[PDB]
Amino acid sequence: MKRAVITGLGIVSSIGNNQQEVLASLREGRSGITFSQELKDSGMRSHVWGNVKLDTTGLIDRKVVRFMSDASIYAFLSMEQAIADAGLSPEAYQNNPRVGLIAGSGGGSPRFQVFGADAMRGPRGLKAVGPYVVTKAMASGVSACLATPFKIHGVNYSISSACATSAHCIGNAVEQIQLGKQDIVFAGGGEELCWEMACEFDAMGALSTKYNDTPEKASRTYDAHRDGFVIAGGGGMVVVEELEHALARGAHIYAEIVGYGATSDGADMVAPSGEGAVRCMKMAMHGVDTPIDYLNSQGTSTPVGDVKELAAIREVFGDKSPAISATKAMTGHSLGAAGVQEAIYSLLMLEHGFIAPSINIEELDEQAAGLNIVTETTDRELTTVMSNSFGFGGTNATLVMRKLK
Amino acid sequence: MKRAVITGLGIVSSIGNNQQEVLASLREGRSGITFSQELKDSGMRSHVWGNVKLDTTGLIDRKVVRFMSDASIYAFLSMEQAIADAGLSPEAYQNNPRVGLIAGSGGGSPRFQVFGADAMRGPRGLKAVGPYVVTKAMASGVSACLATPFKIHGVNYSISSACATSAHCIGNAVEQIQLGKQDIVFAGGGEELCWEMACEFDAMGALSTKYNDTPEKASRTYDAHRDGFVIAGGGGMVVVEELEHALARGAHIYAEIVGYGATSDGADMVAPSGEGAVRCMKMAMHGVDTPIDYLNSQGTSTPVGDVKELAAIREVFGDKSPAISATKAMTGHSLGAAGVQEAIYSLLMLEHGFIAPSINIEELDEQAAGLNIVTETTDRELTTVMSNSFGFGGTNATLVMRKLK
Numbered sequence A, B: 001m002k003r004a005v006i007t008g009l010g011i012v013s014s015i016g017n018n019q020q021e022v023l024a025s026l027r028e029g030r031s032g033i034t035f036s037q038e039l040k041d042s043g044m045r046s047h048v049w050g051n052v053k054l055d056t057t058g059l060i061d062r063k064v065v066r067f068m069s070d071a072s073i074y075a076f077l078s079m080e081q082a083i084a085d086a087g088l089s090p091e092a093y094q095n096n097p098r099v100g101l102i103a104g105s106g107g108g109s110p111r112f113q114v115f116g117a118d119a120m121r122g123p124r125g126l127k128a129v130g131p132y133v134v135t136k137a138m139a140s141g142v143s144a145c146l147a148t149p150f151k152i153h154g155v156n157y158s159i160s161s162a163c164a165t166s167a168h169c170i171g172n173a174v175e176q177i178q179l180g181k182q183d184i185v186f187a188g189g190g191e192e193l194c195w196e197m198a199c200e201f202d203a204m205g206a207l208s209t210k211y212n213d214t215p216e217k218a219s220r221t222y223d224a225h226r227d228g229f230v231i232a233g234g235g236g237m238v239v240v241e242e243l244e245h246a247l248a249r250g251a252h253i254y255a256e257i258v259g260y261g262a263t264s265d266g267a268d269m270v271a272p273s274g275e276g277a278v279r280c281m282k283m284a285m286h287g288v289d290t291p292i293d294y295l296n297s298q299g300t301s302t303p304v305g306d307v308k309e310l311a312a313i314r315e316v317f318g319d320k321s322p323a324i325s326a327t328k329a330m331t332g333h334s335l336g337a338a339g340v341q342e343a344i345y346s347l348l349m350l351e352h353g354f355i356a357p358s359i360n361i362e363e364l365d366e367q368a369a370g371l372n373i374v375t376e377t378t379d380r381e382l383t384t385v386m387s388n389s390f391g392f393g394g395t396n397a398t399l400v401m402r403k404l405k
């Protein structure tokens, strides 16, 4: 069947506002985590986050940004970058039935959802709400807010699966290409950063709370003293294109998506089973005869989550343990945006031939001994890489990408 | 490729808590719209809705329902119904890598989103929020809350696309079967009914407000005096299964999904373009050598909305227009659940050989001139039906189902 490759990428993350800034942060093991006065004032125990260091005001047409929440803004900016990076002129992707968009978020917009309710209960009622809350608060906000302005005529919808959200978006994009239904599918996601949603995770005990005085050390995947993830926001978008189409226009190809796994744990609600993850990685490796040179793990930085994934990786590769690093130690967990941003970090490592370090590991977890966890930036010729996205609700996605000759 | 058929269904709507009750309401053109004190007390202009008349108290185990929002509850109950109706037992669908679940909601759970914010802002903070808000508030709540209890091991995620949400879910399930990845995929969705979310649509001027005195007449699709849709809640689930697998176990086959259309308008944020709908319908009809006997249109019952679809239908068929009926006139708009529920209504009509009436039409709009709009329950031998789902963001989905030879 049809082959799918990545020909462009765009990103707005806690460690950079474009792929160049991100590249630098990755090589330097630079943290994007900072202290959040907003989270502290909300009454939360976790006072750190991976915020986007950019004032988006005026970066998007007023008539367009009026319908958007932060998730949409981040994804929109990421898509602009992706389009330019892919070298696509407007005439090349706009008003084209074979060009689509699949992008979502983990929670839509709790901020505007609460805003509407707060305004409605106020002295002005509906007048305070406004006619833009729906497009900001709906779960499909990210796809709706981008498909319209970019004149997308092909597939258009959002996929939601918590931490696996944008990973499933990319995989679904691949499926469209494989089915011969689309030539190009923009895939990715975005996530707003707000106490409204963050407090829900803190109320679960899923967020780090013992390192508020040293924010850059809070996210410490695989460290013996990890205590939860650090919430983050941002966006990302990649251009998934059918091979012949990309080659025909002389597109720059980062890699071919040679594997996509999507499975379900069917066990616990908010706790990885590990078993589902093993099946997910094996599914993504079907037909892939080249070894995995680097694995960008889910690596949430949670006590139980980290160990479950470690076990799954051991079961899948056994003696074939590849280089492993959890970029979340640097970036925080962007939820709905994580899958696409992490695929992008993996693509940058593959393109520039280096492995980003898994930082803040002062004491490697006992259940990690024997694995090749990279803790220092290492230059190496990579050919095949894997990125795992295992999210709450027992939903799993794995992407395997490989360089073309 | 592989063929996909529906072997079971389940539904919880404003006009029936199961397919039997729904079937009864459809034949008599009964309305599920009622006066809502909740919507009035909130300060909204629209005081009518399509509530689910059912006491779900104790219908779901404690340990399971504690993670669910109303959208998940309705979806869960619909899935139980679907499993039984399909003749499936745990040994056949549980812990099975080839059985998946694709279901979502349009807005997740505004109610628990606001609940978490309200509780957090209280003196108790995190303690008042509780550790169950995430699974209720997240956009993937519907898929996560069902996949776990039903021990689903295959694909697991939610698709969101406003009014087309559950229609795209069914289409994606078909794709999984065509790709040979799954033998069975439960597809559908759910939507809660609350002022929290309802006020967003009212502030947008999309909800009917000139009939709060005569609820059962508020929703009046294709009527010259329409003034917005009536918000509704509920759930739906269908069992999508690979043909040979279904025949092998002697399952009851309602129909085969012979067409699935998915397009994008890339024009306006909250207004159909028509151009996109036309392409969507043609996409679903492509390859279908059999004519469409019945069409369950979007029929939102909005001034511009209704006009656009009719024009699109006229453009697709023209002089050869099939029987058309807007079930939302009696059921309302269940948003994320509308796609699967309307697919089910179309299946019941196809299964029992009859056409549901388009109630509340005193004066047919001039736009529906050369079209066959059924306003009375008519008995006919249907073979091929079509269901259109066009939501905000310019996202379109069309399903074509036909009896099996």
Ligand SMILES: [N+]
Binding pocket: A296, A297, A298, A342, A343, A387, A388, A389
């Ligand atoms: N990852």
Ligand SMILES: [N+]
Binding pocket: B296, B297, B298, B342, B343, B387, B388, B389
């Ligand atoms: N429909």
